[PDB]
Design a protein around this nucleic acid. Sequence first.
RNA 1: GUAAAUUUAACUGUUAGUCCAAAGAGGAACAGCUCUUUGGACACUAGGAAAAAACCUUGUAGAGAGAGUAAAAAAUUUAACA
Lengths: 160, 41, 49, 94, 177, 38, 97
Amino acid sequence: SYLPGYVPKTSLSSPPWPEVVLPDPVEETRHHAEVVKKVNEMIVTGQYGRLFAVVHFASRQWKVTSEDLILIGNELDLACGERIRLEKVLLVGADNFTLLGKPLLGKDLVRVEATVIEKTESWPRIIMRFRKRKNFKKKRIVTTPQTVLRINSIEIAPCL
Amino acid sequence: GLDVIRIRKPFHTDNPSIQGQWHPFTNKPTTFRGLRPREVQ
Amino acid sequence: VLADLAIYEPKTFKSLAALASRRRHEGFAAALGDGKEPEGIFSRVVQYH
Amino acid sequence: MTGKELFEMWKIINPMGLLVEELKKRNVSAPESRLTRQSGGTTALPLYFVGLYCDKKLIAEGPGETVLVAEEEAARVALRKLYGFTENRRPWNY
Amino acid sequence: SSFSRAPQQWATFARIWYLLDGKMQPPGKLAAMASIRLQGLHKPVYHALSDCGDHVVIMNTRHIAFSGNKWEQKVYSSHTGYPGGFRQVTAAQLHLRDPVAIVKLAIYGMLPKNLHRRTMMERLHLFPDEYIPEDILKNLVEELPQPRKIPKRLDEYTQEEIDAFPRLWTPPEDYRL
Amino acid sequence: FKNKTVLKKRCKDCYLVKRRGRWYVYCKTHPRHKQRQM
Amino acid sequence: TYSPLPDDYNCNVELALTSDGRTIVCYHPSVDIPYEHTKPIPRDQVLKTRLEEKVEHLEEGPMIEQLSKMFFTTKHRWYPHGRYHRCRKNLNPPKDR
RNA sequence: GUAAAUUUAACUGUUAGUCCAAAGAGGAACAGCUCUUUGGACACUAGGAAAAAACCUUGUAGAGAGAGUAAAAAAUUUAACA
Ligand SMILES: [Mg+2]
Ligand SMILES: [Zn+2]
């Protein structure tokens, strides 16, 4: 007995993409709790090494690790050799697991530590404007201030 | 003391990868007995 | 940073691709259902105030 | 010491010999080299991933332009993993 | 990965010998995926100055298929520069003369128009039939999936799907047919 | 044949046939009625 | 029974969401190449075994076409360059990691 | 709603003009034609329409190895008649 809505199996009676069934919500939330608890006990025991992070800083996103260097294109009103905490951590990850913020991770969960090690200027940049047959010719030299930060440590805490 | 010249690549890490740098055979499945395509065995 | 993860962290990029594909399947399921089913685990939006 | 590799600081000659000695003294069967992955092979730019297996279980993998150098690199990777000098190890605490 | 620097670099930048089949495939789709693989645009480590191309071995190029009437419509035009060198051959005539010229020309068109195109075309390998030389066969890795689906003519439908497909109309009993 | 854009039957014996991608008026009894669409 | 991606080439990926729903926890242990998926490793009576040292000197055309056939390039890579480019080349390039 | 306007003082330079949309005039209800009027743009930047003055998008200036966008890719296949 054919259902009122049956189509015979032709080339395009059915969608080309395979049918995808999604798991039921209750079993999926239990599975999420199990996976989160597993990753949490990995964090507790310490089965990780050489964490990396994606950190929002100075309108850019830097993929930093420990013992790293980054060059910020502005002055940071800090003395040299000064230890600061980078906070807007978009991502932290290791081998075998990563943690993803929505869009930012918890400050209790992850810390990034950086150190102002250099306050410098950039090499001179030339701005020249030339429009022809109109005697239009203009030159300028700019030197953008810069700050070199060394990323010291990336630490995570068991809070999932 | 370093030169005020052009700095390529405004970041410097010595350990760029932790999960292993991509090679072509990353994200490629293995085959029974490692057979090449159209191997007569 | 997405290209950086693609080159140097293939497992983190695979996890991101799996998350994106799972969100796609949630979107297709919601559009197909068209009713008031549960919104999905990863289709939830964290609101800020 | 920060940015350098173990066999960049400590030069060795026979990583396969060191590996079989370590596995013998920690009571592990002798490793077997197998061709996990292979590209080219007849050309002037081949690619060989050789895997070192122990009791049918992978312990190391290594790339090379020839089979012998791939096997040597796999031995070095095995030594690294067994000794704790892996690239993704925990960084030094300052 | 804990590789040494030189083996790690070699493993990242090594070349792969992809395999591809003709046999009722459209040469434009063949040429699109072959062009991606020849440029190296399938690699996340791609850069135009990094020479990251791969070898592509296309076989059964004699059995390609054109959608529509392209076998008679499509014209390949060339000019031997002597006055009167203007030659225009249809796609049928070009396929009958050279079994690999159509796929070669399609890939040559889709490759970028710079000085790297000839190097990429040297890494391209085309064979009209099932025969491949032995060294290339021992080089091959990853037969790629075909773009088309080979629409499966009437006589190789098995009886199970034949009688699973329902009957749409009842004919009169006195019709000759 | 005569090249025409509009084809017109001039007899009761003329017939329109589409051959080699073009319409034709063929007449067996009056061969002057042969017309070729262009 | 559902996986967003096939789980047999890089890592066994499992996605999870924390109880507050504020962060996404990914677990991806690497996959290992199976032993059965691998392949086993490839393998004058009276005088010396005199070392077979012949080096035939090919002229430029044959040498370049042999190199081009070997490395799958064109001839233009193998043709030489002038003193202007040779002395413009930087012989002490900068080196990062 | 906004912040400019008039007057007073002192002068230069521009006063050989192009296309587009609209209302017209002359010519052939020709012209990358000529003549007025209203309005744009160009003679200043950038992105698009293939190249590109005049069409479309967009203007106020720098550094960035960040992000959201604007305009932005042509579709069509036709003749049986008792
Ligand atoms: Mg004019
Ligand atoms: Zn007639």
